[model samples]
Target: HHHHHHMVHITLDRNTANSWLIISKDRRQVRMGDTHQNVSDNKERFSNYPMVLGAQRFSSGKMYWEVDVTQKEAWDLGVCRDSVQRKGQFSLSPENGFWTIWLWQDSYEAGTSPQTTLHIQVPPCQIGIFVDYEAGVVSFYNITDHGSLIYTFSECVFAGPLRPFFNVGFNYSGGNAAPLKLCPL
Candidate 1:
C-alpha cells in the first residue's frame, strides 16, 4: 500500500511447501529485500501481518499452507501487541488468558476471533487451512488449530490460488523496514 521495508521468501510446489518469512530484526536504515538481515544489526520492535497477494487465485480444492516463523517470541505468526491494526497480540474474547488467530478477507477488513481460541502455547509457527473454497469454507490455524479448529470464515471469497505470494512484514514500529533473510528449512 503505502511505503515500508519488508521481505518474504516464498516457495511453491504441488503438495505442501514452506515459506520462510524473515524480517529485519534491526531498525537501522536498511533496504527491504527478499533476504533476511542480521537480527543484531536490524532488531525488530513492531509487528505486521503480510498478506499473500492473490490468496484467492487457487484451484477450488483442499489446499494447505503454513507460515513458518523464524523469531518465535519476537515475532508471532498470529498475534501482536497493537490492537487497533489487528496486527498486535491476540486476546480471547468472552473469555480470557488465551490467544486467537483473526481472519479477514483483506488486510483492512475487520476480523473476528473465536471464543475457544487455538493456542500453540509454544514458539511461533502456524498453518492456515481452507477445506473447500468452492463451498466457501475457511479456517484460521495455529500449530494447534487442529481437530480443535476454533475460528472459521465461510461467507468470504478468496481472490487467487490461496497460496503464499507475499508475507506480512514488520518494521521498527518507530524505526524503518529492514532487509529480510530466508532459512532453507
Candidate 2:
C-alpha cells in the first residue's frame, strides 16, 4: 500500500564531520571547507572521506528525507549502521553496514556487493531517500519530476541503529565546491 509520505528532519552532526568539512550553523548543510580546520583527531571522524552523518538515528519503521545537491559535481547519500567503521576508507556495501548511492563524474552507482552502475539520463539535483527498516528496503528518487526512482537496495539486514550518511565528494586537484543541504519543508 502506498502510504502518505512523512517527512523526517535530519540534521548534520558537526561532531562527526571531518575537519575539512564545514557544517552549517543549523547543522543541516555541509560543504567542503576551502581549508581544513584544526580539529581534534577523533576516531568517529572520517579521515579520507569528505563525509558527515545525521544526528538522528532510525531503528524501525519507515523514514524519508531529501537533499539538495544542485550544482554539486559529486556526492553520496544513504544510510549506514551506527557501528560502521569511520576511521579509514571502507566499502559502501551492505556487508560493510552501508547502503548508499554515489554520483561522480556524471556516473551513478548503488553501493551493492558488486556495486551497480546506474545510467541516469537526467541527473537529479535534488534526491529523495526512502528507508523502510521493517521491509529492508532503501529507495532513492529524483525529486525533479515530482518523483522518479533512481535506485533501490532491497533485502538489507540492519546490524544496529542506522543514521543518514552524506559525502560531498573528495577534494581532488582543487576540490568539490558544492555543498549538500538537507531539504527543508
Candidate 3:
C-alpha cells in the first residue's frame, strides 16, 4: 500500500517568498538551489529575523503546499529570533527584509529535546529546497536554469520519534508577494 504524500500551500500577502522549506524526520534536507552551502554557524549567521515553527500531524505523508498571506495584518513583524510561536514582537528590529529557512530537531526518541535554533543565510532569487531520505542528503538548489552551486549542510539522516510529527516553517523578512505550490516529486 502506498502512503499519500501530504502538502501545505501558504501565501504571504505581506512578504516575498524568502525561505521555502520542508522538515520531516525521514525527509531529505530540502535543497533550494545550487547556491546552498553547508555552513555550521548557519543557525546563528542566517536568521536576522524570527521564524515561525508550526507543527501538525497528518495521516497523509507528502503535502502539496499553498498559502494566501497578502494582507499586511497577516504577519507579526520585527521579530528578532526564531520560534515566534505565540505571534507578537519578541525583539526590537523593524522586521521587514530577507528570505531564509532553517530547522531544528524539536523532539527526540528518549523524550529529550534538540537544541533550540536560529536561521541563517537568505537565498536570493529562484530557489528550491528538498529533503531526500534515499540520498541521505538534504540539499538546496537554485531555481535558475543552472544550479546556483550552493553548499550542502547536513549529511546525517534526521532521527525520528514514534509517529513523530515534524515542525516546518516559513518567514519573509519582508515583501508583498506570496508563493505558488508545486507538485511534490
Candidate 4:
C-alpha cells in the first residue's frame, strides 16, 4: 500500500468535462462519449478539449492519486491550473499552466516547455500521481513496477489552487476509448 498521508480520493468533476466526454456515475472514471451532450458552456468546462479536473482543489501539502490506464492507448495524468485555457488551441506545458505527462501510444512524454522525452523499459498499467505543493514537485510512478518512477516535473510554479487533471483522450478509431479509472490509494 502507498503511504496514507499522500492518498486522496480523487473525484472527477462532471461539470468540468467536455460535452463529448462522459464522466462515470460514481465519478471515478472518464471517457469520450459517442456524442456530445447539449449543455451550457460553463467557464469551468473544456469546450474543445476532452479533459476534466478533480472536484476538490489542492493548494498546499502532499497529495497522491492513482489512475488505471491499462486499456488506454493514449492519455494524460497530472495537475492543472484552474485558470488554464479551456478552449481552442493551447500548448500542453507548464508555461501554459499545465504540468502533466502524456502517453502517446507506446511513447511517454513530459509536458515541458518543448516537451521532454521519457524512457521506460516497461509500460505502466497504473500510473500514480504525487504532488508536493510546498516543495513544488509533481511526480508520476509506474505502480506495477514496484512503484517505479516514470518522471518528475521538479520546481513547479504553483501559484494558486490546482486540481487533479485527466485527459480521457480523443477516440482514434476506438483505440483510445477506454475509461481512465481513478484508483483508491
Candidate 5:
C-alpha cells in the first residue's frame, strides 16, 4: 500500500513514559514493569497510568505508523497533544486532546468523550495509525484486514505538536501485561 511512503519508524520516548512502564532498549516496544523502576520524576513523565508517547511528533503532512498488538489483551492506541492531561484519570477524547481507540476484552471502542462503541467481525493482529496533520484528521486501520478503516477523527482542532499515544492497561493479575511493539516500515 502507499502507506509505506508515509510510514514512520516510531520509538517510545522513555522520558515521557510512566514509571510503571518498561520501554524496550530499542524504544520500539513498551510493557508493564514488575516494579516501578527508579527514575527521576520529570515533568514529561506521566504521574499516573502505564502510558507512553512516541518520540516523534506530527506537526504537518501525513504519517503512518504500525503497531503489533497480537499479544496484547488490553491497550489504547492513537494520538494526543503533547500537553494532554498527565495527572489523574480523565476521559480520552478530542476535547481532552486525546483521540484514541481501545481494546477491552471482546470490544474495541473509540475513546470519544462520550465513547463510540464499535463491532468488529475479525480482530486485527497489527494496527495502523494514519494521520493527516494539515487536514486535522487521524484514522486507525486494521492491518490484518487489508488495512480497513476502523475509525477516523476528522475536522479535529489540532494545536501545537501531536504525539502518538500508547496506553498499556495494568491488569490486577497482570493479564494485560503484553508488550506493544511499534513497527518500522
Candidate 6:
C-alpha cells in the first residue's frame, strides 16, 4: 500500500480571525493586532482561541502546508476541526479538536491531551504541517534546516472536515507580535 502527498495552499480566513488579531490584506498572514478593536461579536470568531482558520477545509487524504514564523517570539500553528469551538475559553488539546505545536517562552510545546513539551535544538523559522486524515496521522516538521521531524499525532479520529489553524500568540507584551505567514509555495 502506498500513499500520495500533495501540497495544499492555505490562507487565513479573515472572518474567522479573532477581533484582536490582524489578518493581512492578502489573507495569507496573521499577526496579533497592535491594539484591540471594538469589533462586534461573532460566533465563528475566535474569542479565546486567539487564532484563525484557513480558507481551505480537508476531509481526507494527504495534505501539507508550510508557515513562515521568522522573528516570532511565540506562536501556535497546526490543524483543527471545522466545528471546533471558536468562542469562550476551551482547552486547545486534540481532545478538544486542536492538534498544534506552540512556541512560547523560548520553548516548543505540542498541543496534546496532556500537552507535551518539545525539545527542539533549533528554533524553526519555517514549519511544515502534514495531515493524513484517513491514516489518523498529523505530523509537524521543522523546515528551517532542510527538514526534520518535530512531532506526530497518531490515531487522530476526524469527526468532520479539518481546517488549517494558526496563532501568533496573544501576549503581545512579550513581543510575540510578528506575523505568521502562510507560504504560498
Residue 66 lDDT, candidate 1, scale 0-100? 46
Find the number of clashing residue pairs for candidate 5. Answer: 0
* Consecutive 10-residue window with the lowest summed lDDT within model 1: 1-10
Better of 4 and 6 by TM-score: 4
Worst 10 residues of 4 by lDDT: 1-10
Off by over 4 Å in 1: 1-56, 72-124, 144-147, 158-166, 173-185
Candidate 1 lDDT, 52-74, residue by residue in tens: 22213344655444454433222
Model 6 segments more than 4 A misplaced: 1-5, 37-39
- TM-score-wise, the better of 1 and 2 is 2
lDDT of 2 at 161: 95
Candidates ranked, most accurate by TM-score first: 5, 4, 2, 6, 1, 3
Tell me the TM-score of model 6. 0.92
**For model 4, which pairs clash?**
none
Every candidate's CA RMSD: 13.3, 1.7, 15.5, 1.4, 1.2, 2.4
- Candidate 6 — worst ten consecutive residues by lDDT sum? 1-10
Candidate achieving the largest lDDT: 5
For model 4, the stretches where C-alpha displacement exceeds 4 angstroms are 1-4
Q: Model 1 compared with the native: what TM-score? A: 0.38
lDDT of 4: 0.86
Lowest summed lDDT across 10 adjacent residues in model 3 is found at 72-81
- Model 5, 1-185: lDDT tens digits are 45668888888998898988888889999998888889888878877788899999889999999999886778899999989988777878898898899998779999887899876677988999988999988998888988888998999997879999999887676677778998767
Question: Worst ten-residue run, lDDT, model 2?
Answer: 1-10
Per-candidate local distance difference test? 0.33, 0.86, 0.26, 0.86, 0.87, 0.84
